[PDB]
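Summary for the steering committee. The consortium agreed at its last meeting that each partner would contribute one worked example illustrating the joint modelling workflow. Our contribution is presented below. We chose a case with several input lines so that the handling of multiple components could be demonstrated. No manual editing was applied between input and output; the record is shown as generated.
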Amino acid sequence: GQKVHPNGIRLGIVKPWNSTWFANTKEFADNLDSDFKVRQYLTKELAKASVSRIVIERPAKSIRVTIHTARPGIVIGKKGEDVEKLRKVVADIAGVPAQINIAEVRKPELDAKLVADSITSQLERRVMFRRAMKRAVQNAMRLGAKGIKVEVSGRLGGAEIARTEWYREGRVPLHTLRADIDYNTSEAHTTYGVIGVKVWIFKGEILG
Amino acid sequence: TEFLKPRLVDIEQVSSTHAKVTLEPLERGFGHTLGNALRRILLSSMPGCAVTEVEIDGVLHEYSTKEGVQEDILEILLNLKGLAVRVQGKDEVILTLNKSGIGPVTAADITHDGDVEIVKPQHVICHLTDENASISMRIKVQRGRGYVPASTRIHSEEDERPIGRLLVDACYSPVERIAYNVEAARVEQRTDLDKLVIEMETNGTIDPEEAIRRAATILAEQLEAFVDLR
Amino acid sequence: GVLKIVKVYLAVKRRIQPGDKMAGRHGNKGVISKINPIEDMPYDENGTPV
Amino acid sequence: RIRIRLKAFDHRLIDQATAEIVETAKRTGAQVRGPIPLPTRKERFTVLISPHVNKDARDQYEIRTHLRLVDIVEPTEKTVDALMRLDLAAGVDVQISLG
Amino acid sequence: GPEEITADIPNVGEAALSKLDESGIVYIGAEVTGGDILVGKVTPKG
RNA sequence: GGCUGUCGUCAGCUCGUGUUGUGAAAUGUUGGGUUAAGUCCCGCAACGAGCGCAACCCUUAUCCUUUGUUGCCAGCGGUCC
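What follows is the complete predicted structure of the assembly.
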């Protein structure tokens, strides 16, 4: 289990946190649990909507969710009909006043998580994994990624002996802390088993 | 070189908005020069805060209508575009207006923060007629200059905002009317000097000596390109 | 006959610009040429621009 | 005197908050004491990173809780109330205490 | 065959599915301009 | 699938285009020097690129500015020292 998590190593420097609140040792665990719940719910709901990052932020006994999604239109539905619906359920989950914001993700081919999800979907609907991977890589490159890597693993083409294959393009420096490396993962629950998809997308280096 | 320098001698406030100011003493012929230059700068380039984005709850577009009110939503956006706000510390604040009950909605009903000052407590916005009606709008007040309209601010805005925020045009300049007069100065030994009587008419949010100081700094830093380089 | 019948109502808000046509009630046609700033307008001695 | 205890995980954020609070204080009232930095709590955690067994395999995390002690010496009418409407940025637990 | 009202707009990428719902058609309100999509209305084998 | 150890924090592992060979393949990546390092120089049918060897991060060792309580007492007055 060689490698360090690319997001996790960079949280202090170039990457920010998702859950962004303060709490004392008393209420912290509970808060975490709540976050887990709400996030889980959101994932369940907005599966068909291309959702990248849920950012929870709770000040003053009131939860502020921020959903980063590629297509707001399907998450919002009719203007303030679906969002509103989501909100009350979120509140219920939390046990506090809820507030949902929806950030529009520019360039969903450069968002790593989204790409991974797409790949997983493709796998599920029985495409050639390799072709999917290629598409993922190519598209990102076209869009202006300084580099991208993707990796898929296990029961590829329903083969008895599992293996991993991966496509890199451009440069993807992981040891370099200041590199904006959007990393994320997904899992294709195929007929032969799970197929795990990792993808690293290098936006560029930050100078500060 | 037998020239002199002017000072702001007497600053009278005729009201809270309409207020004159003298300038003394000016040299011969300089009166119309400084008056016209300060007029052009004081009408074009003053910083003032104004309403930019209005966020009403349970709304789709600005051409709809709402439950319990008189003015329609375009009328509300016009009456909010006329608002006169004076922030001190920040350059971008968010106010809140919440009110229910039968009667008009003044500007004095906005739940103010500490560093925002609404200088028109009789500015009407809505006329709530149903006692079961409510209205909860969240205004956003930026700070700039000139005139920046909704069409240009349709793609200029970088911070990806969510959909549902009505965009109001930005009338940033708080100066509306300015006139200067070149009288004859009452100098005890000179007869060839004059005074400049600038008669401002503000939005109530700008302080006239501060406005004149800022316009003077704008003119001096523009002329430094002539002074230093050639 | 007709199957899918979706009518969408846009509403453009057009302001005024160099090139529109204004007119009074007397036959004085005009194509609005320059949209001047407030400062460059001819102001009377009271201060109001025209 | 109003003692104010700012607590947060992000230091920059905390700093920002403190400045804001000072600003709020200083316009209304007079003689703000100052933003005094107390000691930071570095609450350390070790965990085994293997699912099953490998004990020398470990990750050592920490949460740096920063403290910012702001004090206000003269509570006026205008000043204290200004804070009620003036909420600070999220992820910064404030704790005002007069006397 | 008949034509179809679906967002699953082709060739064109993440620049079709935007001012609409998951089942197609413009989602109401919005600051639409020129070159946008209002009603996804395209057939297969056309 | 996910997560983990391991050789081994070992200096290695590769790709493109080009070149050679019927080809498996080779070159690059070898050679003189150098270094912790495929670290750097010089040449060279190679030219380039990437992952890696480094750096970016944390901590610690010196100094400065800021801001001084629940922290400190140099100088001052008091003292229950």
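Chains D and C do not touch (no CB pair under 8 Å). Helices of chain D lie at 11-28, 77-85.
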